[PDB]
Design a protein around this ligand. Structure first.
Ligand SMILES: [Ca+2]
Length: 223
């Protein structure tokens, strides 16, 4: 997250870190056994880390649970990043509490102008490189479909939306991939892609989660 703030320990209790010897992506806990992330975060050997603030220090609220299975969306295209969504099942159910909690799926899509919370352990620099170890947060509005498409000619599908600031300065970044965009207590987006970070007229692009609720529910119901 570039131009954000330190969230505070366990203030984003649905935020997970995906770890394969190191943090490589964010995710969102949606029930005791399932995490939603980006399809471009897919790999084998995933451990899901819940209750994290400092990802380099065991602070006492963590739960480390290995993934038993991953399910990339059937229509995911890695070239265009269309349908950039994946489900990860935990080998055991997480113990839910005030600091490890599921985030509700949307019942309807959120509109341009809706204020949301984007969070992650990604790069905090738009030019250089600096990885924070504590969770960073950004309050950002959803942008209009028209402004999103104008920012990225030929690249915005019906399964994507832009959020952030056309002036730049505040954005998601490398390492935030797969993490949450939460608006009015609902998971509306997944950190998916952008062109650099916090650049003028290049806001972050997010997977439009409301399009996938039926797939998420049906997949969970049979796996
Ligand atoms: Ca920790």
């Amino acid at each position: 997250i570039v131009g954000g703030y330190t969230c505070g320990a366990n203030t984003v209790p649905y935020q997970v870190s995906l770890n394969s010897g190191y943090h490589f992506c964010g995710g969102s806990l949606i029930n005791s056994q399932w995490v939603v992330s980006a399809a471009h975060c897919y790999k084998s050997g995933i451990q899901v880390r819940l209750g994290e603030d400092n990802i380099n220090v065991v602070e006492g609220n963590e739960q480390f649970i290995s993934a038993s299975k991953s399910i990339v969306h059937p229509s995911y295209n890695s070239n265009t990043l269309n349908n950039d969504i994946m489900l990860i099942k935990l080998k055991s159910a997480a113990s839910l509490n005030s600091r490890v909690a599921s985030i509700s799926l949307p019942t309807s899509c959120a509109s341009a102008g809706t204020q949301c919370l984007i969070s992650g352990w990604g790069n905090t620099k738009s030019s250089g490189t600096s990885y924070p170890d504590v969770l960073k947060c950004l309050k950002a509005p959803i942008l209009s479909d028209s402004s999103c498409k104008s920012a990225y000619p030929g690249q915005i599908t019906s399964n994507m939306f832009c959020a952030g600031y056309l002036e730049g300065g505040k954005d998601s970044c490398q390492g935030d991939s797969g993490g949450p965009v939460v608006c009015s207590g609902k998971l509306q987006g997944i950190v998916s892609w952008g062109s650099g970070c916090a650049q003028k007229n290049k806001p972050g692009v997010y997977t439009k989660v409301c399009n996938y609720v039926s797939w998420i529910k049906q997949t969970i119901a049979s796996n």
